[PDB]
Amino acid sequence: SVKSEYAEAAAVGQEAVAVFNTMKAAFQNGDKEAVAQYLARLASLYTRHEELLNRILEKARREGNKEAVTLMNEFTATFQTGKSIFNAMVAAFKNGDDDSFESYLQALEKVTAKGETLADQIAKAL
Incomplete structure (x- = not known):
């Protein structure tokens, strides 16, 4: 069902969260070879999550679930x-700009934290 596909998508999202928090540690510790791998792992996780979310959205549209479509x-x-x-x-990591990398990392945390009450609302609307 769309609801189970959402649970699968949310798990993929949460793995990204876990790898992110590990990556952040590695950045703070100055372990660039680890950061590089985590950034590649996150990239593949975010691409997968984007694809699952587009399918959930397309299925909710085909189902006429107007509230789920709006929230999605x-x-x-x-x-x-x-x-x-x-x-x-x-x-910024490629370029060696640690000041920006810090700035972009905190921004990604806040933008992600903000978009969490909506993520729960979608679980209930599907």
Whole structure:
């Protein structure tokens, strides 16, 4: 069901959260070879999550679930903000700009924390 596909999508999202928090530690400790791997692992996790969210949204549209569609449109628009911050963070790592990498990391935490009451609302609306 769409609801189980959402639970699967949310788990993928939570793995990203876990790897992020590990990555952040590695950044603080100055372990760049670890950061590089975690950034690659997060990239593949975020691409997967984006694909599952687009399918959930498309299925809710085909099902005519107008509330779920509304909430998913808002939640995916936030997702595109988080991914933009993530990509810029990746570029700051390539460039060796630790000041920006710190700035982009905290922004991604706040944008993610904010978009959490909506994530719960979608679990109930589907």
